[PDB]
Short mmCIF file of C-alpha atoms in Angstrom, two decimals:
data_model
loop_
_atom_site.label_atom_id
_atom_site.label_comp_id
_atom_site.label_asym_id
_atom_site.label_seq_id
_atom_site.Cartn_x
_atom_site.Cartn_y
_atom_site.Cartn_z
CA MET A 1 0.25 0.57 0.31
CA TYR A 2 3.64 2.26 0.25
CA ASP A 3 4.53 4.72 -2.30
CA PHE A 4 7.47 5.51 -2.51
CA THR A 5 7.47 8.54 -4.39
CA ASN A 6 8.54 11.05 -1.24
CA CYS A 7 11.50 8.22 -0.57
CA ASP A 8 15.19 10.06 -1.43
CA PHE A 9 16.05 8.54 -4.27
CA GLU A 10 19.52 9.56 -4.34
CA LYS A 11 20.62 8.68 -1.21
CA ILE A 12 19.16 5.48 -1.66
CA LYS A 13 21.28 4.63 -5.28
CA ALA A 14 24.71 4.84 -2.43
CA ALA A 15 23.15 2.37 -0.30
CA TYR A 16 23.00 0.25 -3.62
CA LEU A 17 26.03 1.30 -4.55
CA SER A 18 28.41 1.15 -1.27
CA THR A 19 26.40 -1.78 0.61
CA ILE A 20 23.48 -3.76 -1.33
CA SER A 21 24.96 -4.40 -4.46
CA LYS A 22 27.88 -6.51 -2.83
CA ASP A 23 25.43 -8.66 -0.70
CA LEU A 24 23.40 -9.15 -4.13
CA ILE A 25 25.70 -10.39 -6.30
CA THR A 26 28.18 -12.72 -3.41
CA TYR A 27 24.27 -14.16 -2.72
CA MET A 28 24.67 -14.69 -6.58
CA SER A 29 27.41 -17.12 -6.09
CA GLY A 30 29.63 -13.64 -7.61
CA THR A 31 27.01 -12.75 -11.13
CA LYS A 32 25.09 -10.21 -12.06
CA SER A 33 21.99 -10.62 -14.00
CA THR A 34 22.45 -9.99 -17.74
CA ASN A 35 15.86 -12.93 -19.63
CA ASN A 36 13.08 -10.31 -17.97
CA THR A 37 9.87 -11.19 -16.12
CA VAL A 38 9.62 -8.25 -14.51
CA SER A 39 10.77 -4.50 -15.37
CA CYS A 40 10.35 -0.69 -13.42
CA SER A 41 9.08 2.06 -15.58
CA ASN A 42 10.15 4.82 -12.64
CA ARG A 43 12.15 5.00 -9.14
CA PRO A 44 8.84 4.89 -7.32
CA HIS A 45 7.47 2.21 -9.26
CA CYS A 46 11.06 0.18 -8.96
CA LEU A 47 10.86 0.32 -5.36
CA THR A 48 7.52 -0.95 -5.39
CA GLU A 49 8.62 -3.73 -6.89
CA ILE A 50 11.88 -4.45 -5.01
CA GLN A 51 9.92 -3.73 -2.26
CA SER A 52 7.71 -6.93 -3.58
CA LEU A 53 10.42 -9.51 -4.61
CA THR A 54 12.85 -8.80 -1.93
CA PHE A 55 10.19 -8.65 1.67
CA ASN A 56 7.44 -10.66 0.15
CA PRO A 57 6.77 -14.84 0.02
CA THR A 58 5.59 -15.62 -3.48
CA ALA A 59 4.34 -19.19 -5.08
CA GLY A 60 8.19 -20.86 -5.86
CA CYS A 61 10.66 -18.59 -3.28
CA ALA A 62 9.87 -18.00 0.32
CA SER A 63 10.71 -14.05 1.78
CA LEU A 64 14.05 -13.75 1.30
CA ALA A 65 13.78 -11.06 3.26
CA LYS A 66 16.39 -12.67 5.96
CA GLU A 67 18.97 -12.40 3.25
CA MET A 68 22.34 -9.84 4.13
CA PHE A 69 21.06 -7.56 0.91
CA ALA A 70 17.64 -7.73 2.18
CA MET A 71 18.51 -6.51 5.49
CA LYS A 72 20.59 -4.07 3.63
CA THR A 73 17.86 -2.87 1.44
CA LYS A 74 14.83 -2.66 4.89
CA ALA A 75 17.73 -0.15 6.31
CA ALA A 76 18.15 1.72 3.31
CA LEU A 77 14.41 2.11 2.89
CA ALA A 78 14.18 2.68 6.81
CA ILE A 79 16.39 5.63 6.27
CA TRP A 80 15.07 7.51 3.03
CA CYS A 81 11.63 6.86 2.84
CA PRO A 82 9.16 8.53 5.25
CA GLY A 83 6.68 6.57 6.54
CA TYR A 84 7.75 3.39 5.63
CA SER A 85 8.65 1.70 8.87
CA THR A 86 19.15 -21.22 -1.91
CA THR A 87 16.86 -22.43 -4.78
CA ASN A 88 16.66 -22.49 -8.76
CA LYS A 89 13.52 -20.41 -7.86
CA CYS A 90 14.94 -17.88 -5.57
CA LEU A 91 17.59 -17.08 -7.73
CA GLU A 92 15.60 -16.29 -10.11
CA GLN A 93 13.85 -14.56 -8.86
CA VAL A 94 16.99 -12.12 -7.02
CA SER A 95 18.14 -12.23 -10.53
CA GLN A 96 15.04 -9.84 -11.55
CA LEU A 97 16.17 -8.05 -7.84
CA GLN A 98 19.69 -7.58 -9.54
CA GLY A 99 17.88 -6.02 -13.40
CA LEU A 100 15.15 -3.91 -11.30
CA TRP A 101 18.34 -2.40 -9.36
CA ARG A 102 20.37 -1.68 -11.94
CA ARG A 103 17.11 0.64 -13.76
CA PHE A 104 16.27 2.30 -10.56
CA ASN A 105 20.35 3.23 -10.89
CA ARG A 106 20.20 4.69 -13.70
CA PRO A 107 21.32 8.18 -14.91
CA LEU A 108 19.10 11.10 -13.84
CA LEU A 109 19.02 13.93 -17.17
CA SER B 1 7.17 13.59 -37.07
CA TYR B 2 10.38 12.32 -37.10
CA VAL B 3 11.87 9.77 -40.41
CA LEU B 4 13.86 7.36 -40.36
CA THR B 5 15.28 6.70 -43.71
CA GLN B 6 16.48 2.79 -44.91
CA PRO B 7 17.88 1.71 -48.13
CA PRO B 8 14.83 -0.27 -49.85
CA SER B 9 17.32 -3.32 -50.10
CA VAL B 10 20.61 -4.68 -49.81
CA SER B 11 22.71 -7.45 -50.98
CA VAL B 12 25.66 -9.74 -50.19
CA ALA B 13 27.11 -12.97 -51.11
CA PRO B 14 26.92 -15.82 -48.14
CA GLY B 15 29.98 -15.52 -45.53
CA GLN B 16 30.36 -11.45 -46.80
CA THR B 17 29.46 -9.28 -44.10
CA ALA B 18 26.49 -6.74 -44.20
CA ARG B 19 25.52 -3.40 -43.54
CA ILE B 20 22.33 -2.04 -43.17
CA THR B 21 22.25 1.54 -42.37
CA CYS B 22 18.90 4.44 -40.63
CA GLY B 23 19.42 8.19 -40.99
CA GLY B 24 17.80 10.47 -39.45
CA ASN B 25 18.18 14.33 -37.73
CA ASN B 26 20.69 13.24 -35.02
CA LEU B 27 19.94 10.16 -34.62
CA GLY B 28 22.98 9.41 -32.12
CA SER B 29 21.00 11.47 -29.65
CA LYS B 30 18.07 8.67 -29.93
CA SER B 31 18.49 5.10 -28.85
CA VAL B 32 18.08 2.92 -31.79
CA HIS B 33 16.56 -0.72 -31.79
CA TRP B 34 17.03 -3.47 -35.24
CA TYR B 35 13.85 -5.70 -35.64
CA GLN B 36 14.47 -9.11 -38.20
CA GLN B 37 11.09 -9.55 -40.22
CA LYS B 38 11.50 -13.64 -41.97
CA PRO B 39 8.21 -14.04 -44.80
CA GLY B 40 5.41 -14.79 -42.73
CA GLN B 41 6.74 -14.69 -39.26
CA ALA B 42 6.06 -12.03 -36.89
CA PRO B 43 9.44 -9.46 -35.98
CA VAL B 44 12.10 -9.62 -33.85
CA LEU B 45 13.81 -7.64 -32.22
CA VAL B 46 18.00 -8.24 -33.30
CA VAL B 47 19.60 -4.95 -31.21
CA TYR B 48 18.33 -2.29 -28.46
CA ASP B 49 19.96 0.17 -27.87
CA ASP B 50 22.48 0.87 -30.55
CA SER B 51 24.57 -1.55 -29.67
CA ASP B 52 23.42 -4.71 -26.75
CA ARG B 53 22.64 -7.85 -27.97
CA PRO B 54 19.72 -10.20 -26.74
CA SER B 55 20.40 -14.05 -25.30
CA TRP B 56 18.66 -15.31 -28.27
CA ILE B 57 21.11 -13.54 -30.61
CA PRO B 58 24.27 -14.66 -32.42
CA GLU B 59 27.76 -12.86 -31.83
CA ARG B 60 26.90 -11.65 -35.64
CA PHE B 61 24.51 -9.06 -35.55
CA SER B 62 26.41 -6.23 -33.78
CA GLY B 63 25.35 -2.25 -34.02
CA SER B 64 25.94 0.98 -34.06
CA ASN B 65 24.76 4.86 -33.28
CA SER B 66 26.96 7.69 -34.66
CA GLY B 67 25.90 10.87 -35.87
CA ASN B 68 23.01 11.10 -38.34
CA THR B 69 23.88 6.55 -39.15
CA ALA B 70 22.90 3.85 -37.43
CA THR B 71 24.43 0.99 -38.67
CA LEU B 72 23.20 -3.05 -38.41
CA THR B 73 25.79 -4.82 -39.25
CA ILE B 74 25.84 -8.75 -39.88
CA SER B 75 29.01 -10.90 -40.17
CA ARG B 76 29.50 -14.05 -42.21
CA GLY B 77 26.19 -13.65 -43.29
CA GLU B 78 24.22 -16.66 -43.68
CA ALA B 79 21.25 -17.65 -45.38
CA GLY B 80 19.04 -17.47 -42.57
CA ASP B 81 20.11 -14.10 -42.25
CA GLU B 82 17.52 -13.20 -45.28
CA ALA B 83 14.58 -11.12 -44.10
CA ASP B 84 13.50 -7.38 -43.29
CA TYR B 85 15.33 -5.09 -41.44
CA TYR B 86 13.54 -2.48 -39.40
CA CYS B 87 15.71 -0.14 -37.68
CA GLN B 88 12.92 2.00 -34.75
CA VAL B 89 13.41 5.12 -31.81
CA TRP B 90 11.35 6.58 -29.91
CA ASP B 91 10.61 10.56 -31.14
CA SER B 92 10.30 12.52 -27.83
CA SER B 93 9.85 15.95 -29.46
CA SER B 94 6.83 14.25 -31.56
CA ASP B 95 5.77 11.57 -29.07
CA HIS B 96 5.48 9.09 -31.19
CA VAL B 97 7.43 4.53 -31.98
CA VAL B 98 8.95 5.93 -35.92
CA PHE B 99 10.11 2.98 -37.81
CA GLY B 100 12.46 3.02 -40.82
CA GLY B 101 10.88 1.76 -43.91
CA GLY B 102 12.43 -1.32 -44.07
CA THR B 103 15.91 -3.16 -45.84
CA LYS B 104 15.13 -6.26 -47.17
CA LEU B 105 18.32 -8.37 -46.72
CA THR B 106 19.08 -10.53 -49.82
CA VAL B 107 21.87 -13.02 -49.32
CA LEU B 108 22.47 -14.09 -52.99
CA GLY B 109 21.81 -16.73 -54.93
CA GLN B 110 22.03 -16.30 -57.87
CA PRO B 111 24.22 -13.04 -60.06
CA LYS B 112 22.06 -9.81 -59.72
CA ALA B 113 19.45 -9.12 -63.03
CA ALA B 114 18.22 -6.08 -64.46
CA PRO B 115 14.46 -6.43 -64.77
CA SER B 116 12.22 -5.93 -68.02
CA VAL B 117 10.16 -3.87 -68.33
CA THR B 118 6.59 -3.68 -70.22
CA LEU B 119 3.99 -0.73 -70.53
CA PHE B 120 0.55 -0.63 -71.46
CA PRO B 121 -2.07 2.10 -72.18
CA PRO B 122 -5.49 2.52 -72.04
CA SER B 123 -7.12 0.12 -74.32
CA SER B 124 -9.59 1.69 -76.58
CA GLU B 125 -12.75 -0.26 -75.18
CA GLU B 126 -12.01 0.72 -71.49
CA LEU B 127 -12.15 4.48 -72.73
CA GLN B 128 -15.33 4.27 -73.02
CA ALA B 129 -16.02 2.37 -70.33
CA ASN B 130 -14.86 5.95 -68.54
CA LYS B 131 -12.58 4.66 -67.13
CA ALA B 132 -8.93 4.00 -67.55
CA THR B 133 -5.84 1.79 -66.29
CA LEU B 134 -2.08 2.11 -67.50
CA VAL B 135 -0.49 -1.71 -66.82
CA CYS B 136 3.49 -1.90 -65.27
CA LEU B 137 4.76 -5.12 -66.12
CA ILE B 138 8.10 -5.92 -63.74
CA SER B 139 10.35 -8.85 -64.59
CA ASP B 140 12.87 -11.06 -64.45
CA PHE B 141 14.55 -9.29 -61.69
CA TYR B 142 17.07 -10.07 -58.71
CA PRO B 143 17.09 -9.55 -55.76
CA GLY B 144 13.03 -9.71 -55.45
CA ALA B 145 13.22 -6.02 -54.48
CA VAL B 146 11.94 -2.91 -56.62
CA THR B 147 10.63 0.68 -55.98
CA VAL B 148 7.84 1.29 -58.82
CA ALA B 149 6.98 4.90 -59.35
CA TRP B 150 4.86 6.52 -61.50
CA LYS B 151 5.36 10.09 -63.92
CA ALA B 152 2.66 12.16 -65.64
CA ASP B 153 4.51 14.09 -68.12
CA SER B 154 7.61 15.38 -65.66
CA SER B 155 5.65 15.42 -63.09
CA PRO B 156 5.19 12.47 -60.05
CA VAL B 157 2.25 10.83 -59.66
CA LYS B 158 0.83 9.64 -55.88
CA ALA B 159 -3.03 8.42 -56.07
CA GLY B 160 -3.72 5.65 -58.14
CA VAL B 161 -1.13 3.68 -57.32
CA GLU B 162 -1.60 -0.12 -56.56
CA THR B 163 1.83 -2.30 -56.46
CA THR B 164 1.79 -6.22 -55.83
CA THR B 165 4.85 -7.68 -53.80
CA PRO B 166 7.42 -8.89 -55.81
CA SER B 167 6.98 -13.16 -56.51
CA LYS B 168 9.15 -15.71 -57.71
CA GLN B 169 8.29 -16.95 -61.18
CA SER B 170 9.09 -20.18 -62.21
CA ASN B 171 12.81 -18.63 -64.34
CA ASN B 172 13.24 -18.71 -60.12
CA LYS B 173 13.64 -14.90 -61.28
CA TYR B 174 11.45 -12.41 -59.42
CA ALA B 175 8.34 -10.05 -61.10
CA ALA B 176 6.09 -7.43 -60.11
CA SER B 177 2.96 -5.46 -61.80
CA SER B 178 1.97 -1.52 -61.48
CA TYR B 179 -1.29 -0.45 -61.82
CA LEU B 180 -2.21 3.38 -62.63
CA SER B 181 -5.86 4.11 -62.64
CA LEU B 182 -7.05 7.50 -64.42
CA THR B 183 -9.49 9.42 -65.98
CA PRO B 184 -10.24 8.75 -69.77
CA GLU B 185 -10.24 12.65 -69.31
CA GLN B 186 -6.49 12.73 -67.36
CA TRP B 187 -4.98 10.33 -69.80
CA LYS B 188 -5.76 12.48 -72.62
CA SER B 189 -4.58 15.64 -70.54
CA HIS B 190 -1.47 15.11 -70.79
CA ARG B 191 1.70 14.54 -72.79
CA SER B 192 3.43 11.33 -71.81
CA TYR B 193 2.96 8.45 -69.23
CA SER B 194 5.97 7.24 -67.71
CA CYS B 195 6.82 3.95 -65.66
CA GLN B 196 9.89 4.15 -63.50
CA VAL B 197 10.93 1.05 -61.83
CA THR B 198 14.02 1.92 -59.47
CA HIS B 199 16.13 -1.45 -58.81
CA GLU B 200 19.42 -2.08 -56.99
CA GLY B 201 19.78 1.83 -56.90
CA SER B 202 19.42 1.65 -61.12
CA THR B 203 16.35 2.10 -62.56
CA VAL B 204 14.39 1.37 -66.26
CA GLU B 205 12.09 3.69 -67.40
CA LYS B 206 8.72 2.60 -70.16
CA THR B 207 6.70 5.62 -71.48
CA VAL B 208 3.66 6.27 -73.04
CA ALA B 209 1.63 8.71 -75.31
CA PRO B 210 -2.21 9.13 -75.52
CA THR B 211 -1.24 10.28 -78.77
CA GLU B 212 0.35 7.22 -80.13
CA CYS B 213 -2.28 5.21 -79.54
CA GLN C 1 7.51 -18.96 -22.20
CA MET C 2 7.01 -15.57 -22.47
CA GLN C 3 4.13 -15.15 -24.83
CA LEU C 4 1.57 -12.45 -26.44
CA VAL C 5 -1.48 -14.63 -28.21
CA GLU C 6 -3.51 -12.36 -30.45
CA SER C 7 -7.11 -12.59 -31.75
CA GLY C 8 -10.67 -10.96 -32.51
CA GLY C 9 -9.22 -10.83 -35.65
CA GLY C 10 -11.20 -11.23 -39.54
CA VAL C 11 -12.76 -9.36 -42.45
CA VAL C 12 -15.89 -6.55 -42.05
CA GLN C 13 -17.42 -3.67 -43.71
CA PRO C 14 -15.53 0.18 -43.63
CA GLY C 15 -17.95 2.07 -41.00
CA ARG C 16 -18.31 -1.54 -38.43
CA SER C 17 -16.31 -2.21 -35.48
CA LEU C 18 -14.20 -4.46 -34.77
CA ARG C 19 -12.04 -5.34 -30.97
CA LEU C 20 -9.08 -7.65 -30.60
CA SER C 21 -7.49 -8.94 -27.64
CA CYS C 22 -3.79 -10.19 -26.56
CA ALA C 23 -2.80 -12.69 -23.79
CA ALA C 24 -0.36 -12.31 -22.12
CA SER C 25 2.12 -15.24 -20.63
CA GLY C 26 5.52 -15.43 -18.64
CA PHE C 27 5.78 -12.25 -17.35
CA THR C 28 5.13 -9.99 -15.15
CA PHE C 29 2.69 -8.15 -17.45
CA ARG C 30 1.97 -5.05 -15.15
CA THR C 31 5.04 -3.36 -14.99
CA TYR C 32 5.79 -2.79 -19.40
CA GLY C 33 4.20 -0.57 -21.30
CA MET C 34 1.93 -2.28 -24.08
CA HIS C 35 2.07 -1.32 -27.60
CA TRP C 36 -0.07 -2.13 -30.85
CA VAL C 37 1.57 -2.24 -34.14
CA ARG C 38 0.47 -3.20 -38.07
CA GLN C 39 1.63 -4.15 -41.28
CA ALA C 40 -0.33 -3.65 -44.31
CA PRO C 41 0.93 -6.56 -46.77
CA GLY C 42 3.52 -5.71 -48.29
CA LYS C 43 4.11 -2.70 -46.93
CA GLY C 44 6.42 -1.79 -43.69
CA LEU C 45 5.78 -1.84 -39.31
CA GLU C 46 3.46 1.12 -38.73
CA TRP C 47 2.85 2.03 -35.03
CA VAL C 48 -0.77 2.53 -34.08
CA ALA C 49 -0.88 3.16 -30.21
CA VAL C 50 0.66 2.34 -26.84
CA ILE C 51 -0.69 2.19 -23.22
CA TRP C 52 1.02 2.93 -19.86
CA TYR C 53 2.80 -0.27 -17.29
CA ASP C 54 -0.29 0.84 -14.90
CA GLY C 55 -2.67 2.07 -17.99
CA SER C 56 -2.93 5.22 -16.49
CA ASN C 57 -1.45 7.16 -20.35
CA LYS C 58 -2.97 6.56 -23.58
CA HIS C 59 -1.85 7.25 -26.62
CA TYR C 60 -1.95 6.91 -30.79
CA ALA C 61 -1.33 7.49 -33.82
CA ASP C 62 -2.66 10.55 -35.78
CA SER C 63 -4.22 7.84 -38.63
CA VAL C 64 -6.33 6.31 -35.85
CA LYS C 65 -6.55 8.33 -33.35
CA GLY C 66 -9.98 9.25 -32.35
CA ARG C 67 -11.75 6.00 -33.62
CA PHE C 68 -8.80 3.43 -32.18
CA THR C 69 -9.12 2.71 -27.87
CA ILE C 70 -7.10 1.01 -26.19
CA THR C 71 -6.94 -0.58 -22.90
CA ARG C 72 -5.40 -3.16 -20.30
CA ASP C 73 -6.46 -4.99 -17.82
CA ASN C 74 -3.98 -5.79 -15.78
CA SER C 75 -5.58 -8.79 -13.32
CA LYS C 76 -6.57 -10.48 -16.46
CA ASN C 77 -2.98 -9.81 -18.11
CA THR C 78 -4.60 -8.81 -21.52
CA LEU C 79 -4.28 -5.87 -23.48
CA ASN C 80 -7.42 -5.07 -25.92
CA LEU C 81 -8.02 -2.98 -28.93
CA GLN C 82 -11.36 -1.30 -29.73
CA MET C 83 -11.27 -0.03 -33.63
CA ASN C 84 -14.21 1.64 -34.48
CA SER C 85 -15.42 3.46 -38.11
CA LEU C 86 -12.65 0.86 -39.87
CA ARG C 87 -11.66 2.21 -43.43
CA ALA C 88 -9.77 0.02 -46.16
CA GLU C 89 -6.65 1.22 -44.86
CA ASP C 90 -6.64 -0.94 -41.68
CA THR C 91 -6.56 -3.45 -43.52
CA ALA C 92 -3.39 -4.81 -41.71
CA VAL C 93 -2.04 -7.54 -39.85
CA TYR C 94 -2.39 -5.92 -36.30
CA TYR C 95 0.98 -7.01 -33.77
CA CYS C 96 0.85 -6.56 -30.14
CA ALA C 97 4.20 -6.03 -28.81
CA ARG C 98 6.00 -5.61 -24.86
CA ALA C 99 8.07 -2.58 -24.72
CA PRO C 100 9.35 -1.17 -21.41
CA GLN C 101 8.82 1.66 -20.06
CA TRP C 102 11.75 3.97 -18.32
CA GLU C 103 10.23 7.86 -17.24
CA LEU C 104 8.99 9.38 -20.83
CA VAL C 105 10.89 6.95 -22.92
CA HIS C 106 9.53 3.35 -23.92
CA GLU C 107 12.35 1.13 -25.11
CA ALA C 108 12.70 -1.61 -27.90
CA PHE C 109 10.03 -4.47 -28.67
CA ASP C 110 11.33 -7.62 -27.22
CA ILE C 111 8.03 -9.65 -27.32
CA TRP C 112 6.03 -9.43 -30.00
CA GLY C 113 2.34 -11.70 -30.65
CA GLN C 114 1.93 -13.83 -33.60
CA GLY C 115 -0.28 -10.88 -35.45
CA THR C 116 -3.77 -11.08 -36.27
CA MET C 117 -5.41 -10.25 -39.26
CA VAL C 118 -7.40 -7.81 -40.27
CA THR C 119 -9.43 -6.83 -43.23
CA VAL C 120 -11.45 -4.05 -43.90
CA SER C 121 -14.02 -4.70 -47.14
CA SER C 122 -17.18 -5.04 -48.83
CA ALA C 123 -16.56 -7.19 -51.88
CA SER C 124 -17.89 -10.11 -52.55
CA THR C 125 -18.28 -12.10 -55.34
CA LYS C 126 -17.48 -10.67 -58.79
CA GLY C 127 -16.85 -11.52 -62.05
CA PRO C 128 -13.98 -9.89 -64.08
CA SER C 129 -13.96 -7.11 -66.75
CA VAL C 130 -11.33 -8.45 -70.06
CA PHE C 131 -9.73 -5.56 -71.53
CA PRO C 132 -6.69 -5.88 -74.86
CA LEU C 133 -3.32 -5.06 -73.79
CA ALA C 134 -1.37 -3.76 -76.75
CA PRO C 135 1.95 -1.89 -77.15
CA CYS C 136 0.74 1.64 -78.41
CA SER C 137 3.52 1.55 -81.30
CA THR C 138 9.97 -9.04 -79.96
CA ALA C 139 6.66 -7.79 -78.99
CA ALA C 140 3.96 -8.69 -76.39
CA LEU C 141 0.25 -8.51 -76.00
CA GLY C 142 -2.18 -10.15 -73.23
CA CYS C 143 -5.71 -8.87 -71.92
CA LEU C 144 -6.46 -7.50 -68.84
CA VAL C 145 -8.15 -9.07 -65.91
CA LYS C 146 -9.89 -6.75 -63.95
CA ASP C 147 -11.99 -6.54 -60.55
CA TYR C 148 -12.56 -9.65 -59.62
CA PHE C 149 -13.23 -11.15 -56.45
CA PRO C 150 -12.58 -13.70 -54.79
CA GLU C 151 -9.62 -15.80 -56.52
CA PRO C 152 -8.87 -18.02 -58.63
CA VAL C 153 -8.97 -16.91 -62.25
CA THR C 154 -6.88 -18.92 -64.91
CA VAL C 155 -6.45 -17.75 -68.15
CA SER C 156 -5.49 -20.05 -71.19
CA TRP C 157 -4.31 -18.65 -75.10
CA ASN C 158 -5.30 -20.21 -77.83
CA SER C 159 -3.17 -23.37 -78.88
CA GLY C 160 -1.99 -21.57 -82.14
CA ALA C 161 -0.43 -18.39 -80.15
CA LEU C 162 1.31 -20.22 -76.49
CA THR C 163 4.55 -20.53 -79.26
CA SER C 164 6.96 -17.94 -78.57
CA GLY C 165 5.83 -17.88 -74.67
CA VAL C 166 3.38 -16.55 -71.98
CA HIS C 167 3.61 -15.36 -68.53
CA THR C 168 0.38 -14.12 -66.46
CA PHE C 169 1.83 -12.31 -63.47
CA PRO C 170 0.30 -12.66 -60.18
CA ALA C 171 -2.76 -10.45 -59.32
CA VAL C 172 -2.58 -6.89 -57.29
CA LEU C 173 -5.24 -6.89 -54.64
CA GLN C 174 -6.63 -3.43 -54.56
CA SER C 175 -7.69 -1.67 -51.46
CA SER C 176 -11.04 -2.28 -52.34
CA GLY C 177 -10.91 -5.52 -51.94
CA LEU C 178 -10.64 -6.96 -55.35
CA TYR C 179 -8.07 -8.59 -57.29
CA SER C 180 -7.29 -7.43 -60.91
CA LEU C 181 -4.12 -9.57 -62.82
CA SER C 182 -2.43 -9.49 -66.58
CA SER C 183 -1.66 -12.62 -68.83
CA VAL C 184 0.99 -11.48 -71.87
CA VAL C 185 1.76 -13.67 -75.10
CA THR C 186 5.58 -13.32 -76.23
CA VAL C 187 5.28 -12.11 -80.55
CA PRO C 188 7.06 -12.02 -83.57
CA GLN C 189 -1.76 -15.75 -86.74
CA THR C 190 -4.64 -15.00 -83.84
CA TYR C 191 -4.30 -13.90 -79.92
CA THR C 192 -7.74 -14.74 -77.90
CA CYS C 193 -7.14 -15.13 -73.96
CA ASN C 194 -10.16 -17.45 -72.45
CA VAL C 195 -10.71 -16.24 -68.56
CA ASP C 196 -12.63 -18.54 -66.38
CA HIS C 197 -13.64 -17.64 -63.12
CA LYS C 198 -15.56 -20.89 -61.48
CA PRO C 199 -16.62 -18.57 -58.52
CA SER C 200 -18.26 -16.56 -60.59
CA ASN C 201 -19.08 -19.16 -62.50
CA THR C 202 -18.02 -16.44 -65.28
CA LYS C 203 -16.57 -17.01 -68.58
CA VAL C 204 -15.12 -14.82 -71.20
CA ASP C 205 -13.39 -14.73 -74.33
CA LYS C 206 -11.92 -11.98 -75.86
CA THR C 207 -9.23 -11.69 -78.86
CA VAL C 208 -6.61 -9.10 -78.82
CA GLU C 209 -5.60 -6.96 -81.72
#
């Protein structure tokens, strides 16, 4: 229900580059996403999708909230979003997650 | 309204490198995508964001975008690469998706052959039926891509033109037809009509004169 | 497993309405912009319309704006195109394709549907009108088999004329929905083309000069 419209996107990006990214890659056995099934159309939308994939259980993967990258993500949102606060099927989910973060990190004009 | 311009045809020998260009005003400022369409099939993305490949695409395909020209390069051209290729951009100023006209890539299976053209005027019979049809018959050309243009005297004719898609004939070369519909008045009110058939940059022209019929 | 499957295509008369559907599967539909692209026979690709991922914005090409309506259902993963006041120039194969959005930019079309054929025509069974084809001034003559429907017609020349070649060109499908073709014979004797159009039970025999 929470819209990430009022979040501090620049700060969350900085948090990703400094911490969350490394925990994603290590969880991915040292690999980076390149077949996309999920996308995002803007920074508020990306965080909505990142929220769902990171914390909500889906039919195919249990909640990743216990994972390191997930706790780092929870931390970043708690600070910068006001009012906010391994199976083959899970690796596929986290790879989609790297894809969303990549889009979220895109340069401003 | 932004405009992308491609050559209608590009031909390459098997094993040789094919280069399909896409021209547009300050095209280097936009992200150019390329699509492949084999006959009867839906288009397939082969290159996006100027130079990036999808997973399902050979390393033979490569793109580049610079200045006013994007280019799709296909190394070591294979017979299976024969298809129509479209360049495409999203124009932010007009807020439109814009496709290029399309380029037919032909991997040569025989030597290039210029078209032979035959132009017929309207018959005395159909003129009396208050109709008039000029018939331009085009045959024996390869590759199977052609551009047909009509002229009344020296000025082009856009309206009333109907042209077929080139079809492979029994001699394994292509044939095509173009029909120009006129009123009897238009037919008689000109010194000549012309059928311009362009093939591989070279043109074959035929003329008819109403007063000679 | 990522797919787009279309339907709703068919033959209608000008001024009538048609509703196309597109069913997405194997991906999160509600996070992608959806487009309609059409391709007239033997022509290039023409963008038609787009709807944003959340259904918020709908943008059309000028050639269809005010007549076509694009909608989506993100709970059913369905895209639709309501086509009103159809004209002959709307005759085309209609594809749907997904494309990521980023802000106001639409990205590459990575998945396309198989396409559905839409024909706008009032054409009904009709026999051809045959006219002679002779030059204004070796040489060739023939007959023009004009305005018939549906395919096919058969053109046969008299036994005597067929000694130096003959070519019956493929038919042109006009915007009206009617067909026309030409048949030519080579000449340096009588020349008579027999046209048979079984669908209309029409036979025509014309001698050319």
